Amino acid sequence: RNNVLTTLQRNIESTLNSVASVKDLANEASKYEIILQKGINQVGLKQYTQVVHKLDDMLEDIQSREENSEFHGILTHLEQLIKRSEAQLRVYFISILNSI
Amino acid sequence: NSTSLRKMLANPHFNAKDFVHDKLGNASAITID
């Protein structure tokens, strides 16, 4: 049953956005420039990191798409919010890992 | 046919996720809603 999650709901939950559209990812990715620019501790553990799986997994099948202008602009907005998030992550890592 | 499509095609992603945009990719975005 953990395999039923881990096989069926795993790649089912992955291929939710097997086809998914172009503008909506800019909309809710911009809403993850809302929520990803709320910090970590406001947002929370799998909240923050799973939203990183939502832009990670919103940059996801776009390598599978085609080249319009919104393709490149969403590559910029996505990947720069990605590395803002990653920098904030390692900041928080080091922030507690010499809190001693 | 969400049993056939949802259950039988992309639940384990066999076959791949882009063919649903390709083998079912001709002006059927209503059916994708």
Side-chain angles (χ1 to χ4, degrees), chain A residues 15-100, chain B residues 10 12 16 25 27 29:
Chain A
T15 57
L16 293 176
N17 290 318
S18 65
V19 183
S21 71
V22 186
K23 192 262 181 182
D24 299 331
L25 306 181
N27 192 2
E28 301 294 323
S30 299
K31 293 183 183 178
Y32 291 154
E33 198 176 4
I34 295 172
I35 299 169
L36 278 176
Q37 302 306 110
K38 292 180 180 180
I40 294 175
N41 293 320
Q42 175 177 357
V43 176
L45 171 57
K46 290 183 180 181
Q47 291 84 16
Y48 193 83
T49 58
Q50 190 60 37
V51 166
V52 183
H53 295 289
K54 297 305 289 182
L55 297 188
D56 193 2
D57 291 331
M58 198 177 292
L59 197 75
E60 190 67 25
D61 283 332
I62 70 169
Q63 298 89 22
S64 69
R65 304 293 182 184
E66 290 297 324
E67 305 293 326
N68 56 6
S69 64
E70 188 176 358
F71 190 77
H72 292 169
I74 208 166
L75 282 170
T76 301
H77 184 199
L78 278 175
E79 293 173 353
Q80 295 298 316
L81 188 58
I82 285 171
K83 294 176 176 63
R84 284 192 292 271
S85 299
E86 290 176 351
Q88 177 58 44
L89 288 164
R90 301 185 182 94
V91 161
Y92 196 66
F93 183 91
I94 297 165
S95 170
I96 308 174
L97 281 164
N98 287 128
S99 64
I100 291 177

